[PDB]
Amino acid sequence: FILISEFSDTKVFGTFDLNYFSLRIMSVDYQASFVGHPPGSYPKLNFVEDSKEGAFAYVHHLTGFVRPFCMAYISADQHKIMQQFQELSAEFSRASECLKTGNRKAFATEYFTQTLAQLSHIEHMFRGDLCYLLTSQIDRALLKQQHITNFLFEDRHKKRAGQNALKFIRQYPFAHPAIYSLLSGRTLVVLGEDEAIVRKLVTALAIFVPSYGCYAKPVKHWASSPLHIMDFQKWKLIGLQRVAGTLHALSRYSRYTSILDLDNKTLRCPLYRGTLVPRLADHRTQIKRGSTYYLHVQSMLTQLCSKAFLYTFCHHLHLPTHDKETEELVASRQMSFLKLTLGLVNEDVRVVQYLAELLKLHYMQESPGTSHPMLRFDYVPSFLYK
Amino acid sequence: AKTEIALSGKSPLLAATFAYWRVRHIWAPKTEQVLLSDGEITFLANHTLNGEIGAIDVKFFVLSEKGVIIVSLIFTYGLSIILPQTELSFYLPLHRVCVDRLTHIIRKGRIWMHKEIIPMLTGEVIPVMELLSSMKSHSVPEEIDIADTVLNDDDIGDSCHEGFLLNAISSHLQTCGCSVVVGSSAEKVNKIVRTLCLFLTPAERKCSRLCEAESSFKYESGLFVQGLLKDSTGSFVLPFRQVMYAPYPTTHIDVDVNTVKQMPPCHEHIYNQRRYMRSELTAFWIFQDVLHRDTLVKAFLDQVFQLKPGLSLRSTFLAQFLLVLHRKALTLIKYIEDDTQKGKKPFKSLRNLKIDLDLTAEGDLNIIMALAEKIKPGLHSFIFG
């Protein structure tokens, strides 16, 4: 909605949308001759109000006879531009140096598109709002602060991901144990034909996967192969297709799968009766525009990774406080930790029991599944849901 | 036609001038070997004055030629602030205390000239010089090393220090971040001001001020966390006037008695601020205690003191907690922002917001709601008032 243009004692050219429709009504000549030098103005730069709101008004010189030329901003409100003076000063005092240490060469238009691309990068990076830039500064500094737990869920296609995650969850029954299988370490082998449905289900459910390290994802998009245990090692959700068989030969690997069938509306995974996955994913949710839902899930998984950080780095749990260690004592003491303090119930202890192991493998050597392919599993019987 | 003042804790400023249509009076410190004379300040005030040809507008100017940075408000008349180009990041947090601190000077002096002025503005300029003299001397560092705080103490507290440590951080984060800690010594109030300043952004750190052992500071209505100590008699002064003039309410956290007092929420604070400002401009035309506790700060303070102190774990987990606080704030902003059509319809949607966003406790709603107000102003009036 906001505008950006030039000055001199009149308009030179618009840059935001190049003299667009009724979004731009007010004249630039109202802004012109009032943002120049009525004191007379070496690198002057100032900030007024002029109640739209007056904005950053870096005054520049060309010495050549055409000396008055300042470039000016404008936006909606006051504190967006006053509060962000530090990041509007040092991005126009350096973008002008293409023009300053540009056209200072030719007196003793080559860098014109440089200014008309850098300036578009300035309006594109300051396009959003005042709240969004403050939240992105705070999230930037805090993600600079923590450095271990960021890889687990650090990853606008996230809107299309989270919106299809919400359209997954409130429009598919028994998805609590599927998302439990994703968060627990059980390879969700998504099986079914009609490729694009499976791909959108894969990129929707890709948010919940705790990736191994500081590389991209363990997700696999639409593999077509018998899937012996080497694809179950390197990929934690797989997008197989039906051929009109594979369901019978795939059930031989029933210890490492959760076979979600699209053309049959069944799956095969253990029983989930816990409370963490229903608060990550409630059945009915009055949350609209699922990018908000992706912010909710990212906020919740940050707290989950904080619980896994806590369970990993407590000294009095993992170090045995005895001469000879007894796994009844340390297993019951770990279990007493995840029941009492963390407040987890009967499968969430398995979830945090897994994410802590990924966190150990990242901190110790920065290589799980590449040079240490662990693939921990369990003998819990999977039930055929219908 | 100028006066000179000399104060310990050397000045950051250069002068303070008033406009007529040039100078009428100059308030200057007694900084020995001043870098510049008076005529550049007078003629430079003539630069920043006559360039426009009701409310009170603000002007901000940075001169990289002589090396000054000018802040001024113009109402014909104009008050200006002269401070060098040696610092710019020093002033920029103090903008919202300097602007309103000079704006009420402009209101009362504007009515006082409307009844018809230098001696009625000596006592108005003389605090805001001492504020900037205080901020350079003590305020904070940005790097809060957490080795100096209540964290690392290996134990949260025996009987009452756990409840006071829960209510202090809890009531702090419920009251939009603004606090006042008062005491009779310096080391304890410094420990509570650093401990309580872990939970802020480094921009909001630079507003807040530490304690002072020797001289006399006062309350200010713009600092986030203040460490002003009590008198030798065992008392202090929190004036009812200027506490209302602060943009946010305030916790009166009191060490040595371990009580925690609060103020009403910020919609009633802005509303009663409008009541008291209007009803004090028509002349010649209260700490209500903590409502209820929370769950996130109880969980956090429960499970932090099991990690080790000196191994950089508590700061990591603390940054994770501030990360989930700010992300819950941003998804609360998004959920209000799309519940209505970004401020078209009235809100009417608190209950589903409380059950969906894991915020069924109101005392834990107030923290996320307070941060959401702090980086999106105008929510509490939209949903509560």
Short mmCIF file of all heavy atoms in Angstrom, two decimals, chain A residues 292-312:
data_model
loop_
_atom_site.label_atom_id
_atom_site.label_comp_id
_atom_site.label_asym_id
_atom_site.label_seq_id
_atom_site.Cartn_x
_atom_site.Cartn_y
_atom_site.Cartn_z
N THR A 292 -1.04 -19.12 10.42
CA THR A 292 -1.17 -18.97 11.87
C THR A 292 -1.01 -20.31 12.57
O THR A 292 -0.36 -20.39 13.62
CB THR A 292 -2.53 -18.35 12.19
OG1 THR A 292 -2.65 -17.09 11.52
CG2 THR A 292 -2.69 -18.13 13.68
N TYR A 293 -1.58 -21.37 11.99
CA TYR A 293 -1.45 -22.70 12.57
C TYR A 293 -0.01 -23.20 12.50
O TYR A 293 0.45 -23.89 13.42
CB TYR A 293 -2.39 -23.68 11.88
CG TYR A 293 -2.29 -25.06 12.47
CD1 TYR A 293 -2.76 -25.32 13.74
CD2 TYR A 293 -1.71 -26.10 11.76
CE1 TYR A 293 -2.65 -26.56 14.30
CE2 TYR A 293 -1.61 -27.36 12.30
CZ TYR A 293 -2.08 -27.58 13.58
OH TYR A 293 -1.99 -28.82 14.16
N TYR A 294 0.71 -22.87 11.43
CA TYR A 294 2.13 -23.21 11.37
C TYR A 294 2.94 -22.44 12.40
O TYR A 294 3.92 -22.99 12.93
CB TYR A 294 2.67 -22.95 9.96
CG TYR A 294 4.16 -23.18 9.83
CD1 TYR A 294 4.69 -24.46 9.86
CD2 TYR A 294 5.03 -22.11 9.67
CE1 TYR A 294 6.05 -24.67 9.74
CE2 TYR A 294 6.39 -22.31 9.54
CZ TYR A 294 6.90 -23.59 9.58
OH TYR A 294 8.25 -23.80 9.46
N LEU A 295 2.56 -21.20 12.70
CA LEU A 295 3.21 -20.49 13.80
C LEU A 295 2.89 -21.13 15.14
O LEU A 295 3.75 -21.15 16.04
CB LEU A 295 2.79 -19.02 13.80
CG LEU A 295 3.37 -18.20 12.66
CD1 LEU A 295 2.81 -16.79 12.68
CD2 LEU A 295 4.88 -18.17 12.76
N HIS A 296 1.67 -21.65 15.29
CA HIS A 296 1.30 -22.36 16.52
C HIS A 296 2.10 -23.64 16.69
O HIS A 296 2.59 -23.93 17.79
CB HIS A 296 -0.20 -22.65 16.50
CG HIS A 296 -0.65 -23.48 17.66
ND1 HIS A 296 -0.69 -22.99 18.95
CD2 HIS A 296 -1.11 -24.75 17.72
CE1 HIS A 296 -1.13 -23.94 19.75
NE2 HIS A 296 -1.40 -25.01 19.04
N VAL A 297 2.25 -24.41 15.62
CA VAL A 297 2.98 -25.67 15.69
C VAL A 297 4.47 -25.42 15.91
O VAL A 297 5.11 -26.13 16.68
CB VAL A 297 2.70 -26.51 14.43
CG1 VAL A 297 3.55 -27.75 14.39
CG2 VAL A 297 1.26 -26.93 14.42
N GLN A 298 5.02 -24.38 15.28
CA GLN A 298 6.42 -24.04 15.49
C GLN A 298 6.67 -23.57 16.92
O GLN A 298 7.69 -23.93 17.54
CB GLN A 298 6.85 -22.98 14.48
CG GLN A 298 8.34 -22.70 14.47
CD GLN A 298 9.16 -23.91 14.07
OE1 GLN A 298 9.78 -24.56 14.90
NE2 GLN A 298 9.15 -24.22 12.78
N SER A 299 5.72 -22.81 17.48
CA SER A 299 5.80 -22.40 18.88
C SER A 299 5.69 -23.59 19.82
O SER A 299 6.31 -23.58 20.89
CB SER A 299 4.70 -21.40 19.19
OG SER A 299 3.43 -22.03 19.15
N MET A 300 4.91 -24.61 19.46
CA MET A 300 4.75 -25.75 20.35
C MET A 300 5.95 -26.69 20.28
O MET A 300 6.42 -27.19 21.31
CB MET A 300 3.46 -26.50 19.99
CG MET A 300 3.01 -27.46 21.04
SD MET A 300 2.49 -26.60 22.53
CE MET A 300 0.97 -25.86 21.94
N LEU A 301 6.48 -26.90 19.08
CA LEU A 301 7.64 -27.76 18.89
C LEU A 301 8.90 -27.14 19.47
O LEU A 301 9.83 -27.87 19.83
CB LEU A 301 7.84 -28.04 17.41
CG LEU A 301 6.79 -28.93 16.76
CD1 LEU A 301 6.97 -28.90 15.26
CD2 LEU A 301 6.93 -30.34 17.27
N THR A 302 8.96 -25.81 19.56
CA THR A 302 10.07 -25.17 20.27
C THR A 302 10.06 -25.55 21.75
O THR A 302 11.12 -25.81 22.35
CB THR A 302 9.97 -23.66 20.10
OG1 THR A 302 9.90 -23.35 18.71
CG2 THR A 302 11.20 -22.99 20.68
N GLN A 303 8.87 -25.64 22.34
CA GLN A 303 8.74 -26.03 23.73
C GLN A 303 9.05 -27.52 23.91
O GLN A 303 9.65 -27.92 24.92
CB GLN A 303 7.34 -25.70 24.22
CG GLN A 303 7.13 -25.82 25.70
CD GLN A 303 5.73 -25.42 26.09
OE1 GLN A 303 4.89 -25.12 25.23
NE2 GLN A 303 5.46 -25.38 27.39
N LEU A 304 8.67 -28.34 22.92
CA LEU A 304 9.01 -29.76 22.95
C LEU A 304 10.51 -29.99 22.87
O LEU A 304 11.07 -30.80 23.62
CB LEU A 304 8.29 -30.48 21.81
CG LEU A 304 8.53 -31.97 21.65
CD1 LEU A 304 8.07 -32.70 22.89
CD2 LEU A 304 7.79 -32.48 20.43
N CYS A 305 11.19 -29.26 21.98
CA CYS A 305 12.65 -29.34 21.89
C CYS A 305 13.32 -28.79 23.14
O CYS A 305 14.43 -29.21 23.47
CB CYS A 305 13.14 -28.59 20.66
SG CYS A 305 12.63 -29.30 19.10
N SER A 306 12.67 -27.85 23.83
CA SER A 306 13.19 -27.41 25.11
C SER A 306 13.10 -28.51 26.16
O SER A 306 14.02 -28.68 26.97
CB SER A 306 12.44 -26.17 25.59
OG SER A 306 11.13 -26.50 26.00
N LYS A 307 12.01 -29.29 26.15
CA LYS A 307 11.91 -30.43 27.06
C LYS A 307 12.94 -31.51 26.73
O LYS A 307 13.50 -32.13 27.64
CB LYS A 307 10.50 -31.02 27.05
CG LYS A 307 9.49 -30.18 27.83
CD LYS A 307 8.19 -30.91 28.07
CE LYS A 307 7.10 -30.44 27.13
NZ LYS A 307 7.30 -30.95 25.76
N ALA A 308 13.21 -31.73 25.45
CA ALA A 308 14.24 -32.70 25.08
C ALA A 308 15.64 -32.21 25.44
O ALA A 308 16.50 -33.03 25.79
CB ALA A 308 14.16 -33.02 23.59
N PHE A 309 15.88 -30.90 25.33
CA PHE A 309 17.14 -30.31 25.79
C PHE A 309 17.32 -30.53 27.29
O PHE A 309 18.41 -30.89 27.76
CB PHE A 309 17.16 -28.82 25.46
CG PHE A 309 18.43 -28.12 25.84
CD1 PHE A 309 19.54 -28.19 25.03
CD2 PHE A 309 18.52 -27.40 27.03
CE1 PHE A 309 20.71 -27.54 25.37
CE2 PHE A 309 19.70 -26.78 27.38
CZ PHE A 309 20.79 -26.85 26.55
N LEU A 310 16.24 -30.31 28.05
CA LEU A 310 16.28 -30.50 29.50
C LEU A 310 16.55 -31.95 29.87
O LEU A 310 17.40 -32.22 30.72
CB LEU A 310 14.96 -30.04 30.11
CG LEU A 310 14.93 -30.21 31.62
CD1 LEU A 310 15.94 -29.29 32.28
CD2 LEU A 310 13.55 -29.98 32.15
N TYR A 311 15.85 -32.89 29.24
CA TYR A 311 16.07 -34.30 29.53
C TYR A 311 17.45 -34.77 29.09
O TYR A 311 18.04 -35.65 29.72
CB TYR A 311 14.98 -35.16 28.89
CG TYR A 311 15.25 -36.64 28.93
CD1 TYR A 311 15.33 -37.32 30.13
CD2 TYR A 311 15.39 -37.37 27.76
CE1 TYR A 311 15.60 -38.68 30.17
CE2 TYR A 311 15.64 -38.72 27.79
CZ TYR A 311 15.74 -39.37 28.99
OH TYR A 311 15.99 -40.72 29.01
N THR A 312 18.02 -34.15 28.05
CA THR A 312 19.35 -34.54 27.60
C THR A 312 20.42 -34.06 28.57
O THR A 312 21.29 -34.84 28.97
CB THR A 312 19.62 -33.99 26.21
OG1 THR A 312 18.58 -34.41 25.33
CG2 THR A 312 20.93 -34.52 25.70
#
